[PDB]
From a paper:
Altogether CD38 appears to be a key player in the biosynthesis of calcium messengers which are involved in a wide range of cellular functions. The L-shaped structure of bCD38 consists of two distinct domains separated by a cleft and connected by a hinge region.
This cluster of water molecules could provide a means of access for bulk water to the bottom of the active site. In apo bCD38, the residues of the ‘signature motif’, despite being solvent-exposed, have also a limited conformational flexibility.
Numbering used by the authors: 36 to 276
């Protein structure tokens, strides 16, 4: 645990820079071409500039101001999908219904599933290791990116929003998740949130709308003046149907 290899987390996604420029081209040309052209070279440059050659445990939200202003994670009213511990299911649901998760916005699509960090006084990505959230530091560029992006995504929500939660976990709602700490607490009043608790096929559900973790969610939303409807006791096929 010295030099570039000093961190406890996996190193940066190998080939990160090429991956994000490839993804930007796919997004802007093939998947969700926009009203005006975007320059993917410039977006990639802004992404790199946010974190390259800096202390990987001193990341702040402000470091991403330029990048986020370039491509705010905006979704039409009524079409946003939040999710927690249901990644595969939530994205299948959104695809079928023509809705948008955070990973369907430009920046979310770029970064989905990747890791990155730099090193002070170096222009290269650190492929040896990167800060682990728990074992090294929470103020790292990967963690901070998702916090900032998710907050903008939440603030942006209007009309009815849906959250896909895991009915096969003890607690479907985790107050310390990004959804619980950053997204739910930043929904605007008059938003209406519908929560779906979906359990594994062939298995009995483990948490429900009347359980303790959902009471915590209900309390957040009450504070924000957000109407809440909770649906549970269903599996993947019924949910997707
Ligand atoms: C609820 O969460 C569980 C546990 O994370 C999910 O089951 C995991 O699914 C992944 C990918 O399919 C597998 O790699 C793991 O083996 C699974 N773990 C367990 C404990 O089964 C499950 O898919 C989630 N359920 C829903 C409906 O989203």
């Amino acid at each position: 645990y010295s030099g570039l290899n000093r961190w406890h987390g996996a190193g940066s996604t190998a080939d990160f820079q090429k991956i994000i420029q490839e993804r930007c081209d796919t997004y802007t040309q093939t998947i969700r071409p926009g009203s005006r052209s975007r320059n993917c070279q410039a977006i990639r440059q802004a992404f790199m500039s946010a974190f390259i050659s800096k202390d990987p445990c001193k990341a702040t939200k402000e470091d991403y101001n330029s990048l986020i202003n370039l491509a705010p994670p905006t979704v039409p009213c009524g079409q946003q999908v939040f999710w927690s511990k249901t990644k595969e299911l939530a994205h299948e649901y959104a695809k079928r219904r023509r809705l948008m998760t955070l990973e369907d916005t430009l920046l979310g699509y770029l970064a989905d599933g990747l890791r990155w960090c730099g090193e002070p006084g170096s222009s290269d990505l650190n492929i040896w290791s990167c800060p682990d959230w728990r074992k090294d530091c929470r103020t790292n560029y990967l963690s901070v990116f998702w916090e900032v992006l998710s907050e903008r995504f939440a603030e942006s929500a209007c009309n009815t929003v849906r959250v896909v939660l895991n009915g096969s976990l003890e607690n479907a709602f985790d107050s310390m998740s990004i959804f619980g700490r950053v997204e739910a607490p930043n929904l605007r009043p008059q938003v209406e949130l519908e929560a779906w608790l979906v359990h594994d096929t062939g298995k009995p559900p483990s948490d429900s709308c009347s359980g303790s973790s959902i009471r915590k969610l209900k309390s957040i939303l009450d504070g924000r003046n957000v109407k809440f409807r909770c649906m549970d006791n269903l599996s993947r096929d019924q949910f997707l149907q």
